[PDB]
């Protein structure tokens, strides 16, 4: 609630030269090196104590900020976030002082930042070669799990002739990292088409996206090979028919099609009329590869079908465009304003900053600029991010003596 209110009362800027932003970047060094600071922002050097509750170096005076290695610490978006997310620190502190037994409490932002309260150095990816900080909060299970409602994907790989070579390496990596953004409440099945559609794996319907099924789908996807002419109509018939199969267990929600193609000149208007007429099924289309084929039909299926269109032209574009599809799916959850602010607890997982088995309670945070002076609401359909407060399993085991 504080984050929503504070963001609603933040005015955009581009001038952070004299009106700086001061913050502690979790991936700094302990050495008093003023060459560790930044043009647009000024860095806190904190006094770290050692705690046994966390097992690390804590400092309850401010909240650390983690910014992915791909994202510049001083772009305009990040500096605006580093500004308006500084009231979160005093709310963090008052939360802790009410209950001293509280673990990490983090705001994971849609800009990639994570601001977590008990300020600790980033675990193992601050500064050491041969280990790269691949963390990105917008992919963490609690974030994926608070940023949308459960899915029913069907991933339509395009294994035809034209995707052989690099595009196929990128398609199988993209589909691996698309399956990686799936919970146990989400159902998935990978289908592939070239002049006729077929499953890549043994599953003939939407199966649950748990560790074992996801491994089977990944190991099938990595075995896939490119050959033959493309048929979008016969592949989309398969996709739409597998999302109408209600005899199986399903997350009867958010039906999606993730079309991983490169490009053609087929729009399949008739099959989108016959199968997705009232537009219950979204269609996200990905244009993988460094190529030159036409992208008009691909950019058009997404528009026609409530989807979105992403271009994945190289590795290193793989990791962002998936969490982007989640960026899209959260519109209906935003629009139903306060029926969607229910705290949800994640499956047990291992904490990024090492504390072992922790479930985590999440709550999406909405964008509230134009309210009671109703305005255009350009991007008032996205979430700012997800709040998440951890609970340790050792903490629950103490209530079961």
């Amino acid at each position: 609630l504080e984050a929503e209110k504070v963001q609603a009362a933040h005015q955009w800027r581009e001038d952070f030269a004299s009106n700086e932003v001061v913050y502690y970047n979790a991936k700094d060094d302990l050495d008093p090196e003023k060459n560790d600071s930044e043009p647009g922002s000024q860095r806190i050097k904190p006094v770290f104590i050692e705690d046994a509750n966390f097992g690390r170096q804590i400092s309850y005076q401010h909240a650390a900020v983690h910014i992915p290695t791909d994202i510049y610490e001083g772009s305009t978006i990040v500096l605006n976030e580093l500004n308006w997310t500084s009231a979160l620190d005093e709310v963090f502190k008052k939360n802790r002082e009410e209950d001293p037994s509280l673990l990490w409490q983090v705001f994971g932002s849609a800009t990639g930042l994570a601001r977590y309260y008990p300020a600790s150095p980033w675990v193992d990816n601050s500064r050491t070669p041969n280990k790269i900080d691949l963390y990105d909060v917008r992919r963490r299970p609690w974030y994926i799990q608070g940023a949308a409602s459960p899915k029913d994907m069907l991933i339509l790989v395009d294994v035809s002739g034209s995707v052989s070579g690099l595009t196929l390496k990128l398609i199988r990596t993209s589909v691996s990292e698309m399956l990686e953004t799936l919970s146990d409440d989400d159902f998935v099945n990978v289908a592939s088409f070239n002049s006729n559609a077929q499953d890549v794996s043994c599953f003939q319907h939407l199966v649950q996206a748990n560790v074992r099924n996801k491994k089977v789908l990944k190991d099938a996807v990595n075995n896939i090979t490119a050959k033959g002419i493309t048929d979008y109509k016969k592949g989309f018939s398969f996709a739409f028919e597998q999302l109408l199969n209600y005899n199986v267990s399903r997350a009867n929600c958010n039906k999606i099609i993730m079309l991983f193609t490169d490009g053609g000149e087929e729009r399949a208007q008739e099959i989108f009329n016959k199968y997705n007429k009232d537009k219950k099924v979204r269609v996200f289309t990905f244009s993988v590869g460094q190529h030159n084929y036409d992208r008009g039909p691909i950019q058009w299926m997404a528009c026609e079908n409530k989807g979105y269109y992403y271009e994945i032209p190289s590795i290193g574009a793989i990791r962002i465009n998936t969490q982007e599809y989640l960026d899209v799916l959260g519109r209906p959850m935003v629009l139903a304003g306060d029926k969607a602010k229910q705290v949800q607890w994640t499956n047990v997982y291992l904490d990024a900053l090492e504390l072992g088995l922790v479930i985590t309670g999440t709550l999406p945070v909405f964008n509230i600029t134009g309210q009671f002076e109703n305005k255009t609401n350009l991007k008032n359909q996205l979430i700012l991010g997800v709040m998440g407060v951890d609970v340790s399993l050792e903490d629950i085991k103490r209530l079961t003596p």
């Binding site: 958010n254 219950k280 229910q342």
Partner: peptide, 19 residues
């Protein structure tokens, strides 16, 4: 057993941001 409530398919949703 799956989650009780899930949000898709609001009519107010703004579809005009494909890319």
């Amino acid at each position: 057993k799956g989650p009780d409530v899930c949000f898709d398919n609001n009519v107010l949703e703004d579809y005009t941001d494909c890319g």
